[PDB]
Copies of this chain bind each other. A is one copy, B any other.
């Protein structure tokens, strides 16, 4: 899933570099990864950010649980009675 918002650039600046939420300016047409598992792209007239995280939505919710691993921007899906055991996932969404 992605959002797209206007690129206002930085008023006062002599260029339309996109500013991110943490105060970094980015070159027109550049991509960066954020600190919350997103990939963002700076364009002339817009900024888009898309999640890198695929969320598992189809699996045995009785016997299995999903656990988010921030550092790898992903989920694992594992047995409740023993999270060292992996379950099968029939549907992911991103």
Contact = CB atoms under 8 A, between A and B. Distances in A.
A83 interface: no
Indicate how many identical chains form the complex: 2
Contacts of A1: 1, 93-94
Majority SS at the chain A contact face: strand
Interface residues of A, number: 13
Contacts of A4: 54, 91-94
Given A4-B92, A4-B93, 16 more contacts: A1-B1, A1-B93, A1-B94, A2-B93, A2-B94, A3-B91, A3-B92, A3-B93, A4-B54, A4-B91, A4-B94, A5-B58, A5-B90, A5-B91, A5-B92, A6-B90
